[PDB]
Amino acid sequence: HHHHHHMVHITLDRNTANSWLIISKDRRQVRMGDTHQNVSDNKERFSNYPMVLGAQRFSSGKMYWEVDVTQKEAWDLGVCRDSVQRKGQFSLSPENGFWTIWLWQDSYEAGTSPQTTLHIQVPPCQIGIFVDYEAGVVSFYNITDHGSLIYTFSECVFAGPLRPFFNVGFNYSGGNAAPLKLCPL
């Protein structure tokens, strides 16, 4: 792909983070803590899952960023509406305002309803995410495998401003402590 020149500098929004997340000083890395991180509750925080949003809001144009997923067993990545549900249980679907892919139990799936099997020969260590607001497109790229396409959501009905979306996943296994990291331009 040739989307690299739409690169945007994403930072994480602490106020949206689940209360167990640890976000680095530079707001470019996030991991699951082993306990509550001693923050006050608020209506923005994701309560049920280890999720956080980027601070940036997008309503036009073409945007591209990259995320490092090295050694993680489970995660979700993509974009979502600014007005997605924060509290309680919900599924990641375009009906609920999410355009995402994930790793879970050694398989990769796109967050359609119902979910779609992805075909990845080279497990990615870094994922590229491309949004074309006007075109209604969200695409995912395997940076480890020379930028090969993973998945394209097309005919997207964003219906609002978009924010970068992250889930570091639970760490019940003791094998999923590694962070998500926003990779440098």
Ligand SMILES: O=C(Nc1ccccc1)Nc1cccnc1
């Ligand atoms: O896993 C960690 N580092 C890392 C992992 C993969 C790639 C790059 C860095 N950090 C960590 C985890 C648990 C407690 N303290 C620190």
